[model samples]
Structures are given as structure tokens and as C-alpha cells.
Target chain A: FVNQHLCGSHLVEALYLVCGERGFFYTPKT
Target chain B: FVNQHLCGSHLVEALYLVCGERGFFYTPKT
Candidate 1:
């Protein structure tokens, strides 16, 4: 989820996205 | 840019991902 209070917000997927892979936008996780 | 500011940080592409498309983690922008 995202909001106007910050630059970005986390989806549960993006939490995994952060720890598991890298890219400009998209990534993969296990 | 990714950080602990909240739960996640922003990539410019992900910003577009917000305004333009939808998915669990992957999407497209124009």
C-alpha cells in the first residue's frame, strides 16, 4: 500500500521484494 | 531509493507503478 504522507509505502510483496532481489521497479522473491 | 523511513522506500519506477498500474509486485508504466 502507498500514501501521500511519504514517497512510497510497502506492500507485503514489496517487503519480500526488498530482501530477495533487485531492480528499478520489479523483482522476484522465494 | 529504499529505506526504513516507514516499511519501504521509493524507486521512481515504483512511483509510476502506483499511479499507472497494479499487481502484487510487478506492473508496467507509460
Candidate 2:
């Protein structure tokens, strides 16, 4: 029912170990 | 690694660019 390319149906473990569900809206450190 | 500053990495790619997720509502240009 869920996959890497799926959304809302799955939990994003992490994006390149960077952004995820809770981390979805943060500005990266520069 | 990459950049668009943040927008490309955190938003569009999460919803639209990655998967075929749709039915979203947003305020666009007039």
C-alpha cells in the first residue's frame, strides 16, 4: 500500500537523511 | 549537495515532483 515513490500513504523515513514528515518545513543551515 | 536554496528540496519534490500525489489546494498567481 506504500512505497518510496508514494506519499500520504507511507512514512518518509528520511529524504537523503535530511528532510522528512516533521522535518518537512525547515530551512537548511548555511 | 544540491540547491534551490530550499524550495526544490523541501516542498515541490515532496508532493508533486517525487510522486503522482495530487488534489492539493494552494494560492497561486492571479
Candidate 3:
């Protein structure tokens, strides 16, 4: 149960990194 | 070098899953 929670946290961080890039590209000012 | 490549691929998969959910939610017709 705890292990799965950590896995979820890692997944969110990975998605945040990708979204960070997309937001940078799609922005008027990065 | 090869290990880093595999790591990047995993990150891309994670991001794709997250984006998939967002795409479904934001679409006019899902």
C-alpha cells in the first residue's frame, strides 16, 4: 500500500516534467 | 549511455499516460 503511494508520487513528478516542457513551448513568455 | 536512454523512454510513457487523461477530460466529445 505504501509502496504504491510512492509509485504514484513518482508518476506525478514525471508528468510534471513533461508538462513543464509543453507549457514552456506553448507560452507567449517562458 | 544506454541506461539513460531507457530512463528517458520510461519518462515519456509516464507523461503520455497523464496527457491521455487530460485529453479525455478536455475533449468536446470523448
Candidate 4:
């Protein structure tokens, strides 16, 4: 998610890692 | 940011509020 660019990408990646570990992932319903 | 839909909107909104209060905002320097 970081992709070495973009604002908040690192944060996004970090969240993904943390949440992904908990088996929680984004599943947009809209 | 949680405009009633969208993944992570509330988190984004919360971050914006928290960061905004500290004079921080997304600039996307890429």
C-alpha cells in the first residue's frame, strides 16, 4: 500500500498489516 | 469522512480531525 509514494500510503499499509493479521480486511459494501 | 459509505472514511475523518487540529494535513507531495 505504501508504493513508495502518496500521502497516508504508509499508514494504509500499516493498517492493512495490522488488520490483516487479525483476519480483518476491507470489504466495501457500497 | 464517513459520508454514510466508503471504506475507512470514518478513520480518515478521524485522522483528518486529529491531524488538522495539530496543523497537519495531506499534501500528497508525490
Query: What does candidate 2's lDDT look like per residue over B1-22, in tens digits?
Result: 2333335335644444444434
User: Where is model 1 more than 4 Å wrong at Cα?
Assistant: A1-8, A12-18, A22-30, B1-8, B12-21, B24-30
Estimate, for each residue in A1-27, the C-alpha lDDT of model 4 and write its tens digit: 555543343454455446543433322
Each candidate's fnat: 0.05, 0.00, 0.00, 0.00
**What's the lDDT for all of these models?**
0.41, 0.41, 0.39, 0.41
Winning candidate number (DockQ)? 1
C-alpha positional error of residue B23 in candidate 2 after TM-score superposition, expressed in Å:
3.7
Q: Sort every candidate by DockQ, greatest first.
A: 1, 3, 2, 4
List, residue by residue over B1-30, the lDDT tens digit for candidate 1.
875433234543445456444433432222
Which parts of model 2 are misplaced by more than 4 Å? A1-14, A17-30, B1-5, B8-10, B17-20, B28-30
- In candidate 4 chain B, where is summed lDDT lowest over 10 consecutive residues? B21-30
Docking class of 1: incorrect
Model 4: per-residue lDDT, tens digit, B1-30?
335552443444444445543433322222
TM-score of chain A of 4: 0.41
Candidate 1 residue B28 Cα shift, in angstroms, is 14
Interface RMSD of candidate 3, in Å, is 11.0
Candidate number with the higher TM-score (1 or 2): 2
